[PDB]
């Protein structure tokens, strides 16, 4: 009937679950000491006034005043953060051949850093790896604006002088094409795992319903808010509270804490 | 094609 965290772990142990799909959000980022915008952080952000938060990811605002966005980019630009244990756990899932797909709401790029190959990833809100001139459309490796950003200078096209914008997806914009994998990944999965997000926001929320009835949906996260609440299913399992704790429990139940430990150790030194 |  109602399943437990341990059941789930045992189903994974017992490779009854071999094709896990994972969706993550900001709850797995805050432990790497990435800020949460949803304070204190805005120390970086509030100053030039955002008239309201979402402006950070509105184009018209950005055109009128890009400074706040680039403060944020400077914070998250790769180098300046490291994968925490929850990434490394998803890395272990991959390395054991168990991971069909990881969908991430985070723009920190910590999943690739952690070691998960690009083919396993969907970066549904984009990436700082790359950029794109807001006017002329010419695209750029991410490093060719590193220093401007690192100096708090607003980068500018050589071609046309417009503002050059990292390929983070703004409000209003099409998500990546790679998002469209969901149609085949979700019905192929035999476990859905949701970490550090409740998925209140479409079109993530609607994604949750695309797995078959038989397939356990495990959330580890402080709350439930989204469609696990609106439309619960019998094989659902909620492990509410602190993300890291939740995941520590699950690794103990898998029997993987020592192997995790080994992996963390090797990558820290790499 | 779907929008953020
Ligand atoms: N790491 C990143 O790059 C990053 C950082 C902050 C926000 N984001 C946003 C994430 C957002 C999608 O919504 P979502 O990520 O769900 O949340 P959010 O950051 O907007 O709000 C928090 C959400 O995640 C959960 N959550 C966040 N932090 C924790 C935590 N420490 N422990 C437990 N649960 C936690 C919480 O229940 C809720 O659903 C995207 O639109 C990005 O704009 C990304
Ligand atoms: Zn240009």
Determine the Cα–Cα distance for residues A142 and A146; give it in Å rounded to an integer.
Answer: 7
> How far apart are the C-alpha atoms of A211 and A213, rounded to whole Å?
7
Q: Find out whether A222 and A27 touch, Cβ atoms under 8 Å.
A: yes
List for chain B the helix, strand, coil content (%; round to 5). 0, 25, 75
Give the distance, in angstroms, between the CA of residue A81 and the centroid of all CA atoms in the same chain: 14
A20 close to A193: Cβ distance less than 8 angstroms: yes
**Structural domain spans, chain A:** 1-30+84-124+177-270, 31-83+125-176
Residues in Cβ contact with A190 at an 8 Å cutoff, skipping those fewer than 6 apart:
A16, A17, A18, A19, A20, A215
Question: What is the residue whose two structure tokens read 């914070």?
Answer: A75
* Rounded Cα–Cα distance for residues A251 and A168 (Å): 32
CA distance linking residue A132 with residue A163, whole number of Å: 9
How far is A164 from A226, CA to CA, in rounded Å? 35
Give the SS3 label for residue A222: coil
Question: Ligand 1: distance of its center to the CA of A138 in Å?
Answer: 31
From residue A140, alpha-carbon distances to A118, A156, A267 in Å are: 18, 11, 29
Residue A154 CA, ligand 2 centroid: distance in Å: 14
Find all residues with CB under 8 Å of A254, minimum gap 6, and list them.
A9, A12, A13
Q: Which residue of B has its CA nearest to A202?
A: B4
d(CA A102, CA A197): 13
The count of other CB atoms within 10 Å of the CB of residue A110 is 23
Phi, psi (rounded to 5 degrees) for A256: -115, 10
Q: Which residues contact A153 (CB under 8 A, 6 or more apart)?
A: none
Cα-based torsion angle of the residue sequence A134, A136, A139, A143 in order, rounded to the nearest 10 degrees = -60
Residues of A in contact with B4 (CB under 8 A): 57, 125, 169-175
Give me the residue label for tokens 């949803």: A38
Instruction: Report chain B's C-alpha Rg in angstroms.
Output: 4
**Helices and strands: H and E segment counts in chain A:** 10, 9
Q: Identify the CA nearest to A29 among candidates A134, A113, A136.
A: A113
Between CA A251 and CA A257 the distance in angstroms is 6
Q: Are strands A121-123 and A139-141 parallel, antiparallel or unpaired?
A: unpaired
Give the Cα separation of A196 and A23 in Å (integer).
9
Catalytic residues of A: 125
E-state strands within A61-120: 99-104
In order, the DSSP letters of A1-14 are: ----HHHHHHHHHT
Rounded to whole angstroms, the Cα distance separating A134 from A153 reads 16
Nearest partner of A73 among A47, A31, A45, judged by Cα: A45
Joined together, the tokens standing for residue A198 give 């409740």
Query: Which helix H or strand E contains A259, and what residues bound it?
Result: helix A257-268
SS3 string, A67-82, reads HHHHHHHHHHCCCCCC
Pocket of ligand 1 (CB under 6 A): A 25-27, 29-30, 34, 36-38, 105-108, 125, 196-198, 201, 221-223, 225, 242-243
How crowded is residue A82: how many other Cβ atoms within 10 Å of its Cβ?
14
| Degrees to nearest 5, angle at CA A213 with A209 and A219 | 60
Q: Tell me how long chain A is.
A: 270
The method of structure determination was: X-ray
- The pick from A22, A27, A78 for probing ligand 1's pocket by mutation, whose C-beta has the most ligand atoms within 8 angstroms, reads A27
Report the binding-site residues of A for Zn(2+).
133, 136, 157, 160
**Strand locations in chain A (E):** 20-24, 99-104, 121-123, 130-133, 139-141, 164-166, 191-195, 217-221, 236-240
Q: Which of A183, A171, A251, A179 lies closest to A211, judged by CA? A: A183
3-state secondary structure of A174: strand
């Amino acid at each position: 009937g109602k399943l437990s965290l341990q059941d789930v772990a045992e189903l994974i142990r017992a490779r009854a679950c071999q094709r896990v799909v994972v969706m993550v959000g900001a709850g797995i980022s805050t432990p790497s000491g990435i800020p949460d915008f949803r304070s204190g952080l805005y120390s970086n952000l509030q100053q030039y006034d955002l008239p309201y938060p979402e402006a950070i990811f509105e184009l018209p605002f950005f055109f009128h005043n890009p400074k706040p966005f680039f403060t944020l980019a400077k914070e998250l630009y790769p180098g300046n953060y490291k994968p925490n244990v929850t990434h490394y756990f998803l890395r272990l899932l991959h390395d054991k051949g168990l991971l069909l797909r990881l969908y991430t709401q985070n723009i920190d790029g910590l999943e690739r850093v952690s070691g998960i190959p690009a083919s396993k990833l969907v970066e549904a809100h984009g990436t700082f790896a790359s950029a794109t001139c807001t006017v002329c459309q010419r695209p750029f490796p991410g490093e060719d604006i590193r220093a401007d950003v690192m100096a708090d200078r607003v980068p500018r096209c050589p071609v046309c002088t417009g503002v050059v914008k990292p390929d983070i997806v703004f409000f209003g914009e099409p998500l990546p094409q790679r998002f469209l994998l969901h149609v085949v990944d979700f019905p192929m999965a035999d476990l859905l795992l949701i970490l550090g997000t409740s998925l209140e926001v479409e079109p993530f929320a609607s994604l949750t319903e695309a797995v078959r009835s038989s397939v356990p949906r495990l959330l580890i996260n402080r709350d439930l808010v989204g469609p696990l609440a609106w439309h619960p299913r019998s094989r659902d399992v909620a492990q509410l509270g602190d993300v890291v704790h939740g995941v520590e429990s699950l690794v103990e139940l898998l029997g993987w804490t020592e192997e995790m430990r080994d992996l963390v150790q090797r990558e820290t030194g790499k | 094609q779907p929008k953020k």
